[PDB]
Design an enzyme around this catalytic site. Structure first.
Site, PDB file in Angstrom:
ATOM      1  N   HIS E  61     -17.928  60.755   1.275  1.00 57.64           N
ATOM      2  CA  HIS E  61     -17.984  59.781   2.410  1.00 57.64           C
ATOM      3  C   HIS E  61     -16.569  59.091   2.310  1.00 57.64           C
ATOM      4  N   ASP E  91      11.990  63.665  19.958  1.00 55.87           N
ATOM      5  CA  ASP E  91      10.900  64.210  19.145  1.00 55.87           C
ATOM      6  C   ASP E  91      11.006  63.518  17.779  1.00 55.87           C
ATOM      7  N   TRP E 126     -14.840  57.966  -5.489  1.00 57.55           N
ATOM      8  CA  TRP E 126     -13.529  58.379  -4.880  1.00 57.55           C
ATOM      9  C   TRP E 126     -12.395  58.012  -5.866  1.00 57.55           C
ATOM     10  N   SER E 156       1.037  66.627   2.514  1.00 58.30           N
ATOM     11  CA  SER E 156       1.086  66.433   3.946  1.00 58.30           C
ATOM     12  C   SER E 156       1.618  65.015   4.283  1.00 58.30           C
ATOM     13  N   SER E 157       1.112  63.932   3.620  1.00 61.71           N
ATOM     14  CA  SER E 157       1.494  62.532   3.945  1.00 61.71           C
ATOM     15  C   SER E 157       2.879  62.223   3.360  1.00 61.71           C
ATOM     16  N   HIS E 240      -3.840  50.588  -4.627  1.00 60.37           N
ATOM     17  CA  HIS E 240      -3.621  49.408  -3.879  1.00 60.37           C
ATOM     18  C   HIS E 240      -2.690  49.586  -2.675  1.00 60.37           C
ATOM     19  N   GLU E 242      -2.280  52.274  -1.107  1.00 55.46           N
ATOM     20  CA  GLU E 242      -3.174  52.973  -0.185  1.00 55.46           C
ATOM     21  C   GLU E 242      -3.968  52.071   0.739  1.00 55.46           C
ATOM     22  N   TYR E 244      -3.251  49.118   1.937  1.00 49.45           N
ATOM     23  CA  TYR E 244      -2.311  48.516   2.946  1.00 49.45           C
ATOM     24  C   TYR E 244      -1.828  49.677   3.853  1.00 49.45           C
ATOM     25  N   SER E 255      -1.135  44.103  17.231  1.00 46.39           N
ATOM     26  CA  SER E 255      -0.139  43.324  17.828  1.00 46.39           C
ATOM     27  C   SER E 255       0.177  43.847  19.251  1.00 46.39           C
ATOM     28  N   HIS E 290      -5.964  44.015 -10.292  1.00 45.83           N
ATOM     29  CA  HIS E 290      -7.197  43.324  -9.886  1.00 45.83           C
ATOM     30  C   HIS E 290      -8.358  44.287  -9.647  1.00 45.83           C
ATOM     31  N   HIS E 291      -8.084  45.627  -9.674  1.00 44.06           N
ATOM     32  CA  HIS E 291      -9.143  46.647  -9.665  1.00 44.06           C
ATOM     33  C   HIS E 291      -9.688  46.978 -11.063  1.00 44.06           C
ATOM     34  N   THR E 316      -0.282  37.751   5.025  1.00 42.39           N
ATOM     35  CA  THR E 316      -1.409  38.222   5.872  1.00 42.39           C
ATOM     36  C   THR E 316      -1.885  37.190   6.875  1.00 42.39           C
ATOM     37  N   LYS E 319       0.098  36.625  10.189  1.00 37.34           N
ATOM     38  CA  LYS E 319      -0.138  37.716  11.132  1.00 37.34           C
ATOM     39  C   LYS E 319      -1.402  37.261  11.925  1.00 37.34           C
ATOM     40  N   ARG E 438     -23.065  48.575  -7.113  1.00 33.53           N
ATOM     41  CA  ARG E 438     -22.700  49.618  -6.160  1.00 33.53           C
ATOM     42  C   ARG E 438     -22.939  50.948  -6.863  1.00 33.53           C
TER      43      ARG E 438
HETATM   44  C1  HEA Z   1      -7.786  46.976   4.706  1.00 28.79           C
HETATM   45  C2  HEA Z   1      -7.738  47.225   3.384  1.00 28.79           C
HETATM   46  C3  HEA Z   1      -7.902  46.143   2.406  1.00 28.79           C
HETATM   47  C4  HEA Z   1      -7.293  44.964   2.480  1.00 28.79           C
HETATM   48  C5  HEA Z   1      -6.416  44.420   3.608  1.00 28.79           C
HETATM   49  C6  HEA Z   1      -7.768  44.228   1.366  1.00 28.79           C
HETATM   50  C7  HEA Z   1      -7.369  42.909   1.154  1.00 28.79           C
HETATM   51  C8  HEA Z   1      -7.630  42.110   0.002  1.00 28.79           C
HETATM   52  N1  HEA Z   1      -8.456  42.471  -1.067  1.00 28.79           N
HETATM   53 FE1  HEA Z   1      -9.298  44.133  -1.187  1.00 28.79          FE
HETATM   54  N2  HEA Z   1      -9.985  45.799  -1.289  1.00 28.79           N
HETATM   55  C9  HEA Z   1     -10.084  46.947  -0.499  1.00 28.79           C
HETATM   56  C10 HEA Z   1      -9.461  47.229   0.750  1.00 28.79           C
HETATM   57  C11 HEA Z   1      -8.676  46.139   1.173  1.00 28.79           C
HETATM   58  N3  HEA Z   1      -8.572  44.958   0.557  1.00 28.79           N
HETATM   59  C12 HEA Z   1     -10.753  48.055  -0.992  1.00 28.79           C
HETATM   60  C13 HEA Z   1     -11.067  49.479  -0.443  1.00 28.79           C
HETATM   61  C14 HEA Z   1     -11.280  47.561  -2.200  1.00 28.79           C
HETATM   62  C15 HEA Z   1     -12.127  48.204  -3.249  1.00 28.79           C
HETATM   63  C16 HEA Z   1     -12.081  49.729  -3.445  1.00 28.79           C
HETATM   64  C17 HEA Z   1     -13.019  50.386  -4.423  1.00 28.79           C
HETATM   65  O1  HEA Z   1     -13.282  49.864  -5.541  1.00 28.79           O
HETATM   66  O2  HEA Z   1     -13.536  51.519  -4.118  1.00 28.79           O
HETATM   67  C18 HEA Z   1     -10.815  46.271  -2.306  1.00 28.79           C
HETATM   68  C19 HEA Z   1     -11.153  45.644  -3.528  1.00 28.79           C
HETATM   69  C20 HEA Z   1     -10.578  44.378  -3.900  1.00 28.79           C
HETATM   70  C21 HEA Z   1     -10.750  43.768  -5.195  1.00 28.79           C
HETATM   71  C22 HEA Z   1     -11.451  44.298  -6.487  1.00 28.79           C
HETATM   72  C23 HEA Z   1     -12.908  43.848  -6.414  1.00 28.79           C
HETATM   73  C24 HEA Z   1     -13.518  44.610  -7.533  1.00 28.79           C
HETATM   74  O3  HEA Z   1     -13.609  45.889  -7.469  1.00 28.79           O
HETATM   75  O4  HEA Z   1     -14.018  43.865  -8.414  1.00 28.79           O
HETATM   76  C25 HEA Z   1     -10.080  42.530  -5.065  1.00 28.79           C
HETATM   77  C26 HEA Z   1      -9.823  41.382  -5.918  1.00 28.79           C
HETATM   78  O5  HEA Z   1      -8.737  40.789  -6.145  1.00 28.79           O
HETATM   79  C27 HEA Z   1      -9.594  42.422  -3.710  1.00 28.79           C
HETATM   80  C28 HEA Z   1      -8.902  41.229  -3.156  1.00 28.79           C
HETATM   81  C29 HEA Z   1      -8.330  41.359  -1.782  1.00 28.79           C
HETATM   82  C30 HEA Z   1      -7.519  40.365  -1.136  1.00 28.79           C
HETATM   83  C31 HEA Z   1      -7.240  39.012  -1.848  1.00 28.79           C
HETATM   84  C32 HEA Z   1      -7.009  40.875   0.045  1.00 28.79           C
HETATM   85  C33 HEA Z   1      -5.931  40.289   1.080  1.00 28.79           C
HETATM   86  O6  HEA Z   1      -4.675  41.316   1.294  1.00 28.79           O
HETATM   87  C34 HEA Z   1      -6.658  39.574   2.258  1.00 28.79           C
HETATM   88  C35 HEA Z   1      -5.866  38.377   2.850  1.00 28.79           C
HETATM   89  C36 HEA Z   1      -6.375  38.076   4.211  1.00 28.79           C
HETATM   90  C37 HEA Z   1      -7.036  36.993   4.468  1.00 28.79           C
HETATM   91  C38 HEA Z   1      -7.215  36.078   3.314  1.00 28.79           C
HETATM   92  C39 HEA Z   1      -7.538  36.810   5.863  1.00 28.79           C
HETATM   93  C40 HEA Z   1      -6.293  36.396   6.656  1.00 28.79           C
HETATM   94  C41 HEA Z   1      -5.749  34.969   6.471  1.00 28.79           C
HETATM   95  C42 HEA Z   1      -5.910  33.699   6.991  1.00 28.79           C
HETATM   96  C43 HEA Z   1      -6.837  33.269   8.075  1.00 28.79           C
HETATM   97  C44 HEA Z   1      -4.870  32.742   6.352  1.00 28.79           C
HETATM   98  C45 HEA Z   1      -5.187  31.676   5.331  1.00 28.79           C
HETATM   99  C46 HEA Z   1      -6.010  32.206   4.155  1.00 28.79           C
HETATM  100  C47 HEA Z   1      -6.095  31.606   2.959  1.00 28.79           C
HETATM  101  C48 HEA Z   1      -5.395  30.344   2.628  1.00 28.79           C
HETATM  102  C49 HEA Z   1      -6.936  32.186   1.863  1.00 28.79           C
HETATM  103  N4  HEA Z   1      -9.910  43.545  -3.090  1.00 28.79           N
HETATM  104  C1  LIG Z   2      -7.313  44.622  -2.417  1.00 30.92           C
HETATM  105  N1  LIG Z   2      -7.540  45.729  -2.627  1.00 30.92           N
HETATM  106 CU   LIG Z   3      -6.168  46.549  -4.227  1.00 28.93          CU
END
Ligand code: HEA
Ligand SMILES: [C-]#N
Ligand SMILES: [Cu+2]
Ligand SMILES: CCCCC/C=C/C/C=C\C/C=C/C/C=C\CCCC(=O)O[C@H](COC(=O)CCCCCCCCCCCCCCCCC)COP(=O)(O)OCCN
Ligand SMILES: CCCCC/C=C/C/C=C\C/C=C\C/C=C\CCCC(=O)O[C@H](COC(=O)CCCCCCCCCCCCCCCCC)COP(=O)(O)OCCN
Ligand SMILES: CCCCCC/C=C\CCCCCCCCCC(=O)O[C@H](COC(=O)CCCCCCCCCCCCCCC)COP(=O)(O)OC[C@@H](O)CO
Ligand SMILES: CCCCCCCCCCO[C@@H]1OC(CO)[C@@H](O[C@H]2O[C@H](CO)[C@@H](O)[C@H](O)[C@@H]2O)[C@@H](O)[C@H]1O
Ligand code: CUA
Ligand SMILES: [Mg+2]
Ligand code: NA
Ligand SMILES: [Zn+2]
Lengths: 49, 98, 58, 227, 514, 105, 144, 43, 46, 73, 84, 79, 259
Positions: E61, E91, E126, E156-157, E240, E242, E244, E255, E290-291, E316, E319, E438
């Protein structure tokens, strides 16, 4: 000149809503789904030992 | 210590590479490698836009450092103006190959 | 050796509508068919291998 | 354990768990604020026919909406880090217990004095005694003395697992070749449940942890009788 | 003709169209897999009766949604169609290598389907952590087939990223600086720099896994002095960036969509939006552990990864507020693409804010490996990426096809999807706070209520997907052909007509230096 | 930038240019309605007279419609502006959208 | 009137609140009477009739502001149709319950639950707020 | 955006057919597998 | 050189809406059905 | 027949914005106050009240008597 | 550093060839001497069946499955010791 | 004899979460000591503290594996 | 007819044959590892070689023979090459990271020391130092090649390029003999693992680099390069310096510091 919404709008809304509420009520209450709600206020504890 | 035997671009460049190199030597830019310099852009002194057809897209950066580019088709005929700043452009069609 | 670049240039710019990969003449066509036959043949063979490996050979 | 319809954390069993609940409450206040402020500003942008479509100057409003977030993150980080380091502080355990992960059950070793060790396997659903918890009960519980600092050391003898007890704020991965340390102190007696928390194969869902917290004198006689 | 055009392509639009077809098809696979997940969990007990099969479904999945649906659609699909058009280029820089990036994906997907068909599948997550993914706990071909699938998608990527970078740096009009390219082109360039740097690290780590499984190496096997934790660093060091990578082209499209349906000629704070995507790209390489906060990590390393992780919210949020500021004063057009973009802004905010809860390593000890993390990323990542993709797809469908959608049907679809995805994932926060792990095929009885609601939400989104298909059928069935499109003066990709000719910008744009 | 008075004065001058062409008339109105304001009566009065010099009745009416639209839910603005313009409307023979039936949906 | 695809590169006509004066007239070809109207328009507008003013407007522009900005009943069709498909989802769920799912575990039977609930109170599950906190151990009932 | 009227209009009835056919193409094959899951498990 | 324009820049035909329906049905339908069949396959293996 | 006065005509959107951002803020402070009251303080007091005279041996003896332990009958 | 030499008027072909023959190839000839000197077989160590060495978790996909790809009988013992 | 051991105390040389080297160092020390003693004509009981600490910390299976390997001649640490 | 300077490439079968060859080589390695058969692998290796041969043949056609490499085209190629080498540097980086992680914190299984108990490293002053002088020398002789080509000098271009390739080949034979002679193998724990897989990917790159230089040698023989336009030669020289720098890091890290 009345469009699709002018002519069918009201009826789509009414029966969409009526249908959606009826079928989700039926599914929720009539077919044996166990939602497992809190026992608090609803279950009389029974001796187990 | 030395000797020759290695061809030059003058001798051996061909196709479009040769074309660009020959035009550049004449100071010309038929393949659009350089950015055109702006005229004052008035009615009387419009930006002159070469084309090999009867229309060409223009992008106008109205003020220095704008990040927004204003895009429109420039058509053969009377000078047109940028819909944001009014600066004038006129198409000058045709040729490139003899 | 002598520089026969000009001859090659004349040959690859010949106005015959041929794509570059076939523009050297009949040998390009052969090498192309060998390549594509091995690729498509090998791919069908890999699908065959998958089918065979998909089941226990107890 | 969790109970039906629970929304938040299990009640805390240790002072450290309690700390985390208050810190989550602080954080989630902020989270709520922000999300509501946002949903709201958005509906504000979207509910007027008044327009203003010409170029807007940004370097000013950018000040606010970079500095205010930075401030808020500092208001989260300060208590976050205090808890982190407080839990890292030296404590002097009275007891060390090892647990080894396996596919799929936990083994426990209490070798400060005698060689006590045993295996702890989930009770199959069809063998549950009336009133016991599907997927949660074990044949042999991890008996431990209440109101004492215990060192848990966690490892595995096969794939990764992870040893977790949510009511105590505990989760330490179980990695072969490695010996991870965590400390545990229960303010109360009772039975405290967790579940393996790193995917380790077919039966990841079925190797739970059950801690049994009792007075020291009962732990000592239980230990003697398990030899 | 057919084979020359569609198998031997050197055209960016047609190769973009193939990526979109490929990604739509992957999407139906990853969707079926997610509904199998939610059916297993939809009531207490066992559905499949085979938890190795459950773990294989979960694994497939994630790989399908990430590598075969999201990345192809966003970068291969929208990046190929739109980036050359938006910079007036004829192109991609390497139009023939571009076609091999595409064609590498069907073989990579086939290897993935092979790994699920042979033996008992790869039931690894995964993340494919050893030793569970090693040759003792997952003996036989399934995990090697998975690794090879990743190798091909990686190649490919990486060649895609070289193509986009070069194209964007080298092929703009001579007068257009980098600070004059639209934000979508910025979002693709940044995504590509991250692909380029991160995928070779995954490739090195899964290669080590392959040799541990087949050549008696012991990189991750403590019996030879190896360490499973080393694989996790290599994996997340890629993993990580990945995440973004998966969302940045979505932020680019967002945007453009917010600007466009606000009647605006430009997004608010363009250089702030550039700065934010660059900072997120840079900082996306220093937060990976942090993972790994439960692995047994020293405290000062935990304090540092918590703090570096928080700092990323700052760019973030610029934006998010800049999208709100773009809407401000707009002549708001309530098209289906605008609704998708607004739903995006809201879901992404929710998911970024649970990310912030998680950043705190002390709370993450208790939330890690629970449904609270699954809820975080299905909001911020999963629904964020899907909503941007649906927004982009409804907005630019008439450009790619020359036909219009029915706007009413497309509003209906958004509405069903928005209810489904929230009914599916919101309850998982409760499950994760209360301690449900999970990667589980079944759960202690207390968790029944939220699992049941979550599985029911999942069928609501199924209904939205089947409707999406019929909606696309309806457009091609009715053939309402486009006549006029507004705001072409600040949306260059629309200016060659709908659809544009096979070859555009044969004569380049004229842009004066001044 | 500049005072309200200087902004308004610049717009007045823009539309008072005797030989203003049809392009300039459109550019000026389409740029002006981008701002966060409903244009003062003296600006609209200059635009309307520019419509006269360009023999374009329809654009004068369209200019009145967009004033009303720029006011959004501030229903007091448009009637005040029309009041202020009434001598010019009379002088030039410009009917309002309402007098034309063009306010009906 | 008639707009053509092959005109895409030419300025076109649009009705938009924010672009009141579009780049071309809605009607560009004029009949003999429409040409006499455009002549008439070079003279005082006071001599134009109401009908003639309207006709001039309708030559320059397609829809008025009031026409182009009118609200619609589309929302009813959108919200009704979405509730219809949501309702249709429940039918899939009724089917899945009837044909796919078997009986859930015996631990959900009423008597099992009563005994489990007593045991959870005996072990004082969540005694601070969550669960046992809500039981009165003196009166032996759920707190009211 | 503006567009021409449909070249090949798709009436309410034809929509109903395209929609049913689309839903059945997703529902029947998965319905059939899930309905027979017992048969798989013990076989 | 190739057909250009609406309905011609795609690897599939949209000349007939019913043939198109069939093709789209097979194309999305095969994707959606594949995981059910893979699970059926793995169950039936043992 | 009286003339209408001149209304505000300028900065209407900015005025609407100024006004409501201040309201958005106040909703937040009056909510912060609420969350701090119905959840956060409520928690500190639940824990504090629970433990104030908590007698852990007494709690154990009731569990032991209920028969819940493996190690203590 | 600035190395310990001079030229730098221009860095042309003549200079780089001067470096190739005057410095680089002579280094290689020096290293080749220092190598084809310290070479000659060293006394292979007693075999000890260390559990971190001679790893076998899966047979190698060639030979009898127990020999490394560049197995040297002289100096690579199998898990059971040096070969006959 | 200066004992009274409940468990291994905090050891500032091994303050963090990974305690593997703590276990291993103590196991080494005990066996180094026991060797120094049982050689040079003395008492293994001075070695007792390291024995207690490694017993408390080390998984039974590690101690068991390391003991077999010392018997086999394949123990890789220096004793 | 275009009035930009960029290259529109004729529709080509090589992307698809390259993709299928990747599927055959990966399928193939799977078949080899698990189903004891080399057949798929041999076919995907063959089609891969044929794909690279024809695809690069075509680039030479498009440029030397047809003139499509305008300055703008050549500049994109220079970006693409640099980006490529960056991606290879990150690839080696994950193997350096594996090496340092395992050697900086040696586990008890190894003896708790580096090199592990029972490992006897090569002396870094013997053949590894020789390898180092060989690759450093070949970086001087290729820079002589490069200046000769720019100075219009065909014979000294061919001579310096020949010396460069002979040194690559000497490095590769020295390494093959080192591999044979080494008393430790890839199965000797993480020391063998990291040694062989890092130096082994490096050796493959030396083989690729050497092949690329041989391609440039034959093109030079055929007069394809002008004194000003010779991107194929530049790219192969950049890739060659990359391979030398990676070696210097392997030498310093694995052979010297890790000894
Ligand atoms: C789109 C993809 C994406 C993005 C953008 C993020 C964004 C963030 N992630 Fe996450 N994250 C995942 C995809 C993503 N993540 C995935 C797939 C996993 C787990 C995968 C797995 O284990 O299989 C994951 C897992 C993950 C973990 C590990 C949890 C664990 O397994 O125990 C952590 C902890 O630090 C974390 C933190 C964050 C934070 C702090 C952001 C930030 O970049 C977010 C910031 C955005 C905001 C905060 C909202 C916007 C802001 C405002 C409105 C402004 C003001 C805000 C403040 C003052 C706080 N993420
Ligand atoms: C954050 N992943
Ligand atoms: Cu991450
Ligand atoms: C198992 C062993 C395997 C070895 C592996 C092989 C790899 C090496 C590759 C090939 C090298 C081949 C050499 C080619 C030789 C002749 C090329 C012919 C061209 C030529 O003759 O070049 C001449 C110099 O050559 C010359 O001495 C060539 C000189 C070679 C120098 C190296 C020998 C060492 C010399 C001993 C002195 C060392 C003391 C050094 C101290 C100081 C160092 C810092 C210069 O003359 P010219 O008048 O400017 O020419 C103009 C037109 N040609
Ligand atoms: C001569 C010096 C140059 C090295 C090239 C040598 C040729 C052999 C084959 C090619 C290897 C090249 C790639 C590197 C891969 C792994 C090991 C290579 C290093 C090597 O050759 O190691 C040998 C082991 O080879 C073995 O197992 C070999 C097993 C051979 C099969 C290789 C398996 C290939 C799988 C690789 C998948 C690569 C995926 C990368 C994808 C790129 C990112 C997308 C060492 O011999 P030994 O007997 O153990 O010790 C010597 C004792 N006398
Ligand atoms: C037994 C051996 C088998 C090994 C398998 C792989 C090995 C072989 C690869 C060796 C590389 C051969 C590459 C030859 C490329 C020849 C085409 C070429 O060099 O093309 C040049 C363009 O550069 C270009 O595309 C440059 C294109 C650059 C390609 C370089 C790629 C290195 C490839 C690495 C592949 C594996 C990756 C790593 C695996 C871990 C043509 O332009 P010029 O030279 O300016 O000429 C024009 C002038 O004449 C005009 O006056
Ligand atoms: C996770 C997403 C899945 C969504 C839920 C799908 C719900 C609607 C599915 C309808 O599918 C079918 O319905 C049957 C019955 O309702 C089946 O017939 C079976 O049932 C019969 C009667 O009970 C017999 O007539 C047959 O032979 C037959 O195999 C079966 O073939 C199937 O195609
Ligand atoms: Cu053990 Cu999961
Ligand atoms: Mg984990
Ligand atoms: Na289940
Ligand atoms: Zn301009």
């Amino acid at each position: 000149a009345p469009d699709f919404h002018d002519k069918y709008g009201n009826a789509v809304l009414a029966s969409g809503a009526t249908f959606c509420v009826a079928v989700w009520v039926y599914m929720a209450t009539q077919i044996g789904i166990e939602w497992n709600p809190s026992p608090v206020g609803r279950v009389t504890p029974k001796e187990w030992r | 210590a030395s000797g020759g035997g290695v061809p030059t671009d003058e001798e051996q460049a061909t196709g479009l590479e040769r074309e660009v190199m020959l035009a550049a030597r004449k100071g010309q830019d038929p393949y659009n490698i350089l950015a055109p310099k702006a005229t004052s852009g008035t009615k009387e002194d419009p930006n002159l836009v070469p084309s090999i057809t009867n229309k060409r897209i223009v992008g106008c950066i109205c003020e220095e450092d704008n990040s927004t580019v204003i895009w429109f088709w420039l058509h053969k005929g009377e000078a047109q103006r940028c819909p944001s700043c009014g600066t004038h452009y006129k198409l000058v069609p045709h040729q490139l190959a003899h | 050796f002598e520089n026969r670049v000009a001859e090659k240039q004349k040959l690859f710019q010949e106005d015959n509508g041929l794509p570059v990969h076939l523009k050297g003449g009949a040998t390009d066509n052969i090498l192309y068919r060998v390549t594509m036959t091995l690729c498509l043949g090998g791919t069908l063979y890999s699908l065959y291998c998958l089918g065979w490996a998909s089941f226990p050979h107890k | 354990m969790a109970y039906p319809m629970q929304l938040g954390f299990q009640d805390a069993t240790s002072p450290i768990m309690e700390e985390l609940l208050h810190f989550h409450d602080h954080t989630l206040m902020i989270v709520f604020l922000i999300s509501s402020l946002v949903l709201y500003i958005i509906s504000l942008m979207l509910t007027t026919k008044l327009t203003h479509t010409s170029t807007m100057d940004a370097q000013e409003v950018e000040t606010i909406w970079t500095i205010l977030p930075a401030i808020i993150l500092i208001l989260i980080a300060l208590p976050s880090l205090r808890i982190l380091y407080m839990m890292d502080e030296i404590n002097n355990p009275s007891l060390t217990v090892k647990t080894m992960g396996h596919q799929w059950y936990w083994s426990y070793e209490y070798t400060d004095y005698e060689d006590l060790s045993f295996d702890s396997y989930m009770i199959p659903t069809s063998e549950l005694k009336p009133g016991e918890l599907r997927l949660l009960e074990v044949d042999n519980r991890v008996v431990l003395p209440m109101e004492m600092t215990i060192r848990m050391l966690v490892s595995s003898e096969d794939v990764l697992h992870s040893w977790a007890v949510p009511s105590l704020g505990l989760k330490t991965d179980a990695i072969p070749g490695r010996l991870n340390q965590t400390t545990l102190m229960s303010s109360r007696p009772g039975l405290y449940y967790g579940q393996c928390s790193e995917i380790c194969g077919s039966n990841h869902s079925f190797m739970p942890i059950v801690l049994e917290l009792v007075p020291l004198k009962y732990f000592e006689k239980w230990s003697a009788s398990m030899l | 003709m057919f084979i020359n055009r569609w198998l031997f392509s050197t055209n960016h639009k047609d190769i973009g169209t193939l990526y979109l077809l490929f990604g739509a098809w992957a999407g139906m696979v990853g969707t079926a897999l997610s509904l199998l997940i939610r059916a297993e969990l939809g009531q207490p007990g066992t559905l499949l009766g085979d938890d190795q099969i459950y773990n294989v479904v979960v694994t497939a999945h994630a790989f399908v949604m990430i590598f075969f649906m999201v990345m192809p659609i966003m970068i291969g699909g929208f990046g190929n169609w739109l980036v050359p058009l938006m910079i007036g280029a004829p192109d991609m820089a390497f139009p023939r290598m571009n076609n091999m990036s595409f064609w590498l994906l069907p073989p990579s997907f086939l290897l993935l389907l092979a790994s699920s068909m042979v033996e008992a599948g790869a039931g690894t997550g995964w993340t494919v952590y050893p030793p569970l993914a090693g040759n003792l706990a997952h003996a036989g071909a399934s995990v090697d087939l998975t690794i090879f699938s990743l190798h091909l998608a990686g190649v490919s990527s990486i060649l895609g990223a070289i193509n986009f970078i070069t194209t964007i740096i080298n092929m703009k009009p001579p007068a257009m600086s980098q600070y004059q390219t639209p934000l979508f082109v910025w979002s693709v360039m940044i995504t590509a720099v991250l692909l380029l740097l991160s995928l070779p690290v995954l490739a090195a780590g899964i290669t080590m896994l392959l040799t541990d499984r087949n050549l008696n190496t012991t990189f991750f096997d403590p019996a030879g002095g190896g360490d499973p934790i080393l694989y996790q660093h290599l994996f997340w060091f890629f993993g990580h960036p990945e995440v973004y990578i998966l969302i940045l082209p979505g932020f680019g499209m967002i945007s453009h969509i917010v600007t466009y349906y606000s009647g605006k000629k430009e997004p608010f704070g363009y250089m702030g939006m550039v700065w934010a995507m660059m900072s997120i790209g840079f900082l996306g390489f220093i937060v990976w552990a942090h993972h790994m906060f439960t692995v047994g990590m020293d405290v000062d390393t935990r304090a540092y990864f918590t703090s570096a992780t928080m700092i990323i919210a700052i760019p973030t949020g610029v934006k998010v507020f800049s999208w709100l500021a773009t809407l401000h004063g707009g002549n708001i057009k309530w098209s289906p693409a605008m609704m998708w973009a607004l739903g995006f802004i809201f879901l992404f905010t929710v998911g970024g804010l649970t990310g912030i809860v998680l950043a705190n390593s002390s709370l993450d000890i208790v939330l890690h490996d629970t449904y609270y993390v699954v809820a975080h990323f299905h909001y911020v990542l999963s629904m964020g990426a899907v909503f941007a993709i649906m927004g982009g797809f409804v907005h630019w469908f008439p450009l790619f096809s020359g036909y219009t959608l029915n706007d009413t049907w497309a509003k209906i679809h958004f509405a069903i999807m928005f209810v489904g995805v929230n009914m599916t994932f919101f309850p998982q926060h409760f499950l994760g706070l209360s301690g449900m792990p999970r990667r589980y095929s079944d759960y202690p009885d207390a968790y029944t209520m939220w699992n049941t609601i979550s599985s029911m939400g999942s069928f609501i989104s199924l209904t939205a997907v089947m409707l999406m298909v019929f909606i696309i059928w309806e457009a091609f069935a009715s053939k309402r052909e486009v006549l006029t499109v507004d705001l072409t003066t600040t949306n260059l990709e629309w200016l060659n007509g709908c659809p544009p000719p096979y070859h555009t910008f044969e004569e380049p744009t004229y842009v004066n230096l001044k | 930038h500049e005072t309200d008075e200087e902004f308004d004065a610049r717009w007045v001058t823009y539309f008072n240019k005797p030989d203003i062409d049809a392009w300039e008339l459109r550019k000026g109105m389409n740029t002006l309605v981008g701002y966060d304001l409903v244009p003062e009566p003296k600006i609209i009065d200059a635009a309307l007279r520019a419509c006269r010099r360009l023999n374009d009745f329809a654009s004068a009416v369209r200019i009145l419609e967009v004033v009303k639209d720029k006011a959004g839910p501030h229903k007091e603005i448009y009637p005040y502006v029309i009041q202020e313009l009434r001598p010019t409307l009379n002088e030039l023979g410009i009917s309002t959208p309402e007098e034309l039936g063009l306010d009906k949906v | 009137s008639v707009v053509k695809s092959e005109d895409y590169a030419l300025p076109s006509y649009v009705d938009r609140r924010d672009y009141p004066l579009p780049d071309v007239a809605h009607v560009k070809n004029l009949s003999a009477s429409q040409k006499a109207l455009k002549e008439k328009e070079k003279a005082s507008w006071s001599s134009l009739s109401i009908d003639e003013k309207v006709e001039l407007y309708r030559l320059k522009f397609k829809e008025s502001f009031a026409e182009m900005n009118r609200s619609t009943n589309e929302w009813k069709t959108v919200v009704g149709a979405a509730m219809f498909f949501i309702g249709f989802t429940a039918l899939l769920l009724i089917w899945e319950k009837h044909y796919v799912y078997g009986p859930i575990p015996h631990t959900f039977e009423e008597e099992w639950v009563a005994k489990q609930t007593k045991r959870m109170l005996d072990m004082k599950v969540a005694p601070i707020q969550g669960f046992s906190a809500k039981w009165d151990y003196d009166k032996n009932e759920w707190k009211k | 955006i503006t567009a021409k009227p449909a070249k090949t209009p798709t009436s309410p009835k034809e929509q109903a057919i395209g929609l049913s056919v689309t839903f059945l193409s997703f529902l029947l094959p998965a319905g059939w597998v899930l309905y027979h899951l017992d048969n798989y498990k013990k076989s | 050189h190739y057909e250009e324009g609406p309905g011609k820049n795609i690897p599939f035909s949209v000349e007939n809406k019913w043939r198109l329906l069939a093709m789209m049905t097979l194309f999305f339908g095969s994707g959606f059905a594949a995981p059910f069949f893979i699970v059926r396959h793995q169950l039936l293996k043992k | 027949s009286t003339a209408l006065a001149k209304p505000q005509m300028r900065g209407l959107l900015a005025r609407r914005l100024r006004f409501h951002i201040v309201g958005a803020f106040m909703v937040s402070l009056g909510f912060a106050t609420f969350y701090k009251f119905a959840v956060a303080e409520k928690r500190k007091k639940a824990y504090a009240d629970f433990y104030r005279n908590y007698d852990s041996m007494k709690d154990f003896e009731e569990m032991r008597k209920a028969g819940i332990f493996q190690s203590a009958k | 550093a600035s190395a310990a030499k001079g030229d730098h008027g221009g860095t042309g072909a003549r200079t780089w060839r001067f470096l190739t023959f005057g410095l680089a190839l002579p280094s290689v000839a020096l290293c080749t001497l220092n190598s084809w000197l310290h070479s000659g077989h060293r006394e292979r160590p007693a075999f000890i069946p260390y559990h971190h060495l001679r790893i076998r978790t899966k047979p190698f996909s060639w030979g009898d499955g127990n020999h490394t790809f560049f197995h040297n009988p002289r100096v690579n013992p199998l898990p059971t010791g040096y070969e006959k | 004899k200066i004992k009274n051991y409940q468990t291994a105390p905090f050891d500032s040389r091994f303050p963090n979460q990974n305690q593997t080297r703590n276990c291993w160092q103590n196991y080494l020390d005990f066996h180094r000591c026991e060797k120094a003693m049982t050689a040079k004509g003395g008492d293994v009981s001075v070695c007792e503290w390291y024995r207690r600490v490694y017993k408390s910390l080390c998984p039974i299976s590690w101690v068991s594996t390391w003991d077999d390997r010392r018997a086999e001649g394949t123990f890789p640490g220096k004793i | 007819h275009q009035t930009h300077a960029y290259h529109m490439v004729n529709p080509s079968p090589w992307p698809l044959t390259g993709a299928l060859s990747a599927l055959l080589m990966t399928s193939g390695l799977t078949m080899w590892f698990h189903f004891n058969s080399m057949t798929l692998l041999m076919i995907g290796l063959t089609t891969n070689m044929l794909t690279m041969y024809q695809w690069w043949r075509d680039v030479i056609r498009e440029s030397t023979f047809q003139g499509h490499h305008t300055p703008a085209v050549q500049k994109g190629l220079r970006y693409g090459m640099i980006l490529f080498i960056i991606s290879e540097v990150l690839f080696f980086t994950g193997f350096f990271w594996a090496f340092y992680h395992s050697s900086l914190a040696p586990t008890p299984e190894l003896g708790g020391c580096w090199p592990p108990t029972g490992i006897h490293p090569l002396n870094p002053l013997e053949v590894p130092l020789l390898n180092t002088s060989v690759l450093l020398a070949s970086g001087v002789s290729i820079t002589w090649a490069h200046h000769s080509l720019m100075e219009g000098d065909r014979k000294h271009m061919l001579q310096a390029l020949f010396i460069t390739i002979t040194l690559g080949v000497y490095f590769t034979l020295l390494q093959a003999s080192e591999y044979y002679e080494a008393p430790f193998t890839i199965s000797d724990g993480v020391y063998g693992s990291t040694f062989f897989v890092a130096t082994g990917f490096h050796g493959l790159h030396v083989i690729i680099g050497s092949t690329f230089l041989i391609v440039c040698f034959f093109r030079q023989l055929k007069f394809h390069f002008t004194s000003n336009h010779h991107f194929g030669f530049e790219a192969a020289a950049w890739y060659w310096h990359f391979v030398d720098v990676v070696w210097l890091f392997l030498y310093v890290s694995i052979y010297w510091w890790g000894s």
